[PDB]
Amino acid sequence: SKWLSGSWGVRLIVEGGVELDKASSYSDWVKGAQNIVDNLPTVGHVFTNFTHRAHGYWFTLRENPYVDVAKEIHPEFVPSLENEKIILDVIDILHKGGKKVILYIATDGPSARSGTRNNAEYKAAWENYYNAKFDGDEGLAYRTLCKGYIERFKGLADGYWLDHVGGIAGELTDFIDMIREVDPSVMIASNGIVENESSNKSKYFKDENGDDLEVDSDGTNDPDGRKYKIRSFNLNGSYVDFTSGHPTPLAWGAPPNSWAYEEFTFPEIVDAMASYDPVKHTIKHAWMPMRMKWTSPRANLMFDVEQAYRFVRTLTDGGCAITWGNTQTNGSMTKEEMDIMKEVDRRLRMRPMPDYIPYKRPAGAKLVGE
Ligand SMILES: O=S(=O)(O)C[C@@H](O)CNC1CCCCC1
Ligand SMILES: O=S(=O)(O)C[C@@H](O)CNC1CCCCC1
Ligand SMILES: O=S(=O)(O)C[C@@H](O)CNC1CCCCC1
Ligand SMILES: [Ca+2]
Ligand SMILES: [Ca+2]
């Protein structure tokens, strides 16, 4: 379990399903994986894909011991037999490079009742399957489909990051139970529902009256005046091993480099890990987008090297983990981001590591309550 504590990581997006088939002719994810290994020796872990980013009906593997997905469900759910080797080769390079591998799953699956883009044809094909073979029990159908791939990733995936969990077929706990039944040693994070041991509301920082804090301004030249709440990652739900780390949503106007994360979110979990008790606690982990969008290289890059270095240092010094939300082009990390990752890595290899520039509240940055 402990490998995640103090680890920093990057994302290598691998597409799934028919989208992987379409992207394979002009992309090389093997190069992208080798690129990470060769340039980022200090990186401890890499996030990549069991499903396509944010889409539960596109998988990175094809063959499945419990279902011929192409013949029984829909051919676009799986890549070609040749292209299913992409994710396997990626994992081999990362493992051979000494990296741990966390696999992303959009758990709302083909019915797409959460963040997966709705696709009527995909949903109908899926319903035809689970009604014919599972007599209407979508939850068991979905767990069984996924089980086949969890089985194939045994020893390859070191963890799983579950998204869209409010739309999962059946009970999320049954789905997590299924994973642990296949491989009880993998680390599991869930983007909601089972992280907060105390409640099913999202956890925000609060004042003495129990009201949520709100950022008013990010600084004198804040480009977006929308106020936003500040997520806490101090979450110890029993079903998960590490915190999902999803910060306040970008679409609400919360920048991923928010000063409030340096002042509230990160110090809280650094302090939590200072008392880490594996019997009681998750490994505290942050997944911070590099840009104002998670996966679009055209979105504004929100980190320079000095702030990215402080983010990684602050969290990993304290035994937390951090993952970057990197973007990919043609199967390799976007250059402008790799340049930053490389400079972070360079500094982390120095002995002593150089001090980071101290966090100071930006000019004009303030809470509503100030
Ligand atoms: O980074 S991923 O896409 O794999 C998972 C999640 O963090 C992204 N959520 C956004 C929400 C806004 C619209 C598109 C998806
Ligand atoms: O993904 S779904 O819409 O199906 C599940 C939905 O309950 C999750 N969003 C809540 C509300 C906003 C703060 C975070 C938690
Ligand atoms: O987190 S809570 O549900 O307590 C309140 C907060 O989420 C509402 N934010 C919306 C979201 C996107 C449009 C602008 C405002
Ligand atoms: Ca949807
Ligand atoms: Ca703002």
Author numbering: 25 to 394
Quote what the paper states about this structure:
Fucoidanases (EC 3.2.1.–) catalyze the hydrolysis of glycosidic bonds between fucose residues in fucoidans. Fucoidans are a compositionally and structurally diverse class of fucose-containing sulfated polysaccharides that are primarily found in brown seaweeds. Here, the structural characterization of a novel endo-α(1,4)-fucoidanase, Mef1, from the marine bacterium Muricauda eckloniae is presented, showing sequence similarity to members of glycoside hydrolase family 107.
By crystal structure determination of Mef1 at 1.8 Å resolution, a single-domain organization comprising a (β/α)8-barrel domain was determined. The amino acids in the groove are largely positively charged, as is especially evident for Arg35, and are likely to assist with the binding and positioning of the largely negatively charged sulfated fucoidan polysaccharide. CAPSO, which is normally used as a buffer, is a small, sulfated molecule and the sulfate group of CAPSO 1 is coordinated in the Mef1 crystal primarily through Arg35, while the EG site is close to a small α-helical structure stabilized by Ca1.
